[PDB]
Amino acid sequence: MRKILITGGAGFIGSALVRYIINETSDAVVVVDKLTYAGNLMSLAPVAQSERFAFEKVDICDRAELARVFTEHQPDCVMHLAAESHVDRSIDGPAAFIETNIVGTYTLLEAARAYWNALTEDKKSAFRFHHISTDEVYGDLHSTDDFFTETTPYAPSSPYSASKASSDHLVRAWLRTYGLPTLITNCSNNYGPYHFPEKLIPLMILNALAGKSLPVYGNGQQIRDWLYVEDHARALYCVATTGKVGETYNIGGHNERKNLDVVETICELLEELAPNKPHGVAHYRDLITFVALRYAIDASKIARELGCVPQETFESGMRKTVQWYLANESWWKQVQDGSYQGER
C-alpha cells in the first residue's frame, strides 16, 4: 500500500486524481490543501469516507506543518499540484501566486529532501517527487504545424506561467544537485466534472442553460488541445508509479479544437440533452455573441514510453461533461452560492 501525498488535492485536477486512486486503486492518500477559493471539499466527498483517505489542511509554504505531515504520514511519494492561478495586487507584499508557486515549491522540495534524506536505502530509491506543471511554459507556437514537445525551449509569457516555469527549474535542479528523485509532467487545458463555474467550458454550459449570451472573442479561431480531467488523472498516476526519474512527459488530449467548435458543440449537445430551452430562446446557438493563437501538445513520448494514452475524445469527453453538469446541479450551485467554502 502506497501512501501518496498530494498537494492541491482539493482542487479541480487534484480532486480527480484523488477520486481515481481511491476508486480504481488499492493505494492510500494524504491530501495537503490549504483550502483557497479554489479548493472544494465537496469534490472529495465521494471518497472522503475511505480508510485510505486522509486530509491535512496545510499551507505548502509552512515548513513546520509540512515537516509534521511528512513525519506523521510517511508518504512513499509526493504529487505536487498545488498552485495559484490568480494574479493579485502587489500593494501589500508579494502576491500569492509568487508565494505559492515559487516559494511553496521550494519549501516542499526542502521538506521532502529532509524526509527523504533520512529514509532507509530501500525507501530511498523508491521515493518519488512528481511535479505538475503547464504547457504555458513553452510559450507560443510559430507555425500551424508545430507542437509543444518536452524539448521545446521555455518562453513563459505571463506572470503566472513565469511562476510555473520557475517551479519547474527548481524541481529539476534539486535532483541534479541533491539527487532528490524528481519528475515533471506538463499538460494542456483540462475540462470535465467538478470544474469551477466561472471557467470557459462550464461557463458556456451554464450560461446557455440560463439563456445568456455566449461570448466568443475574435474569430473564435483560437485553437487548443483539450484534455479530459479523468484522463489526466490516469496519466499522472501512471507517471508517478512507473515514470522514470529525471524525465519530463507532456500529457495532452490528442486534439486540436477551435474555440467556436467548443461553443457549437456545447450548444449542439444542449439541444439534445436540454430540449426545453430558456424563455424566448429558439436555439441555443442563437446565444453565441462575437465580442471579437494556437496551442497544441505532442504527447507521443508518454504514449511510447509509458504506453498511457487518453481514453476519451473531445466528443466523448464533452458529452460526459455536459451530462455531468445537468446531473450535478447541487455542486455548481453551491459554488456559485459561495456556500461551498463553509463546508465540512
Added chain:
Amino acid sequence: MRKILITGGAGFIGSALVRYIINETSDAVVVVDKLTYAGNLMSLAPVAQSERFAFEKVDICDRAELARVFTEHQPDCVMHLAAESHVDRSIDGPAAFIETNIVGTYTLLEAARAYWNALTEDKKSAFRFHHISTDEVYGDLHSTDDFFTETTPYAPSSPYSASKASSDHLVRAWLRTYGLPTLITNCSNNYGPYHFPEKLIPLMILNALAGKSLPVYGNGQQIRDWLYVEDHARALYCVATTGKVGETYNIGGHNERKNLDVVETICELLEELAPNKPHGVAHYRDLITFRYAIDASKIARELGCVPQETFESGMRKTVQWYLANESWWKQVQDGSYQGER
C-alpha cells in the same frame, strides 16, 4: 542627463558600472544596495563625491522603501544587478537566494511598473528596465565546438542558476503582459579590479604573493570564457542606453581559456611585476600542484559593443591593480570593510 537606478551597485560588477558612469559619462546614478557581505562601499569611494552620485541602503525586497526611492529620485532607467550568490539551507522561510533573486526581482518589477505607469507618455516610452542575468541559465554544452547563444534553451542545473532563470522569466513576462520596457543581458565569468579576495583569480594572485600552493585541479583543462569587468560595464551601459526593448544580449570576453592558462599567466605576470619573490620561492610556477563558452556576436553586430581587452591585456591590468591596492583587499580579508562609510 539620465538618472540611472542601479541595484547591487556596491557589488563587484555593479561598482565597476557606477564608476564608469560617473567617470566617463555625464549621467547620474542612484545606487540601491542593502550591503550584504558582498557589498563594499570602498569600491564606490573613488566616485562617491560626485553630485551625480546617490546611495540608498535599501533591500529590493522592501516594497515600501522601493516605492519611496522611485518616487524620490525619479530614475529614467533601471539596471538590476542585485543578486545573492550564496545558497544556504533555511528551516523557516525561503533562503536569501530565493528571496532576493526571485522575490526581489518581482518586487522591483512591480515597483518600477507602478512608477512607469504614472509617467508622462514621453517619459514612459523612454523608460528602460535592464536586467542582468548569467550564462549558467543555458546549462551544459554538449560538444567542444558549440557556444551559448541568446537562443539556447534554458536548462539551469543549480539552485542559484535556477533562481536566476526564474528572474529572467519574470522580466520577459512583464513586458509581454504589462508592456514594461524590459531587456536582458547574460554574461560569462568576470574578473578584474575590486574582485573579492576569496575569488579564483584574485585568490591565485594573493596566494602566490604569499608563497602558498597554487592548486591546479584535474589537469586544469576546464575551459571558460573570461570577461573583464570594465569591458562588461561599458557593454551594460551601451545595452541600456541604446539596446532594443525586449531583446536579449549575450556578453563575453571573446575567449576560451583553460584553468592552467589562467594560473600560469598569473605566475608569469607576477614574475615580472613582482620580481621580489616570497621567502624560499624561486619561481611562481613551482607553486602549482595537481566547457563553457559564449557567443556574443549579436551585441557586436547590432549594438557594435565589443570587448576592449584581451585575456592577456585584462589579466595584466588585474594583477597591477592588486599590487597597487593592498589597502582594499586587506580590508576585505580584515572584515573592516563592513564598517566603512
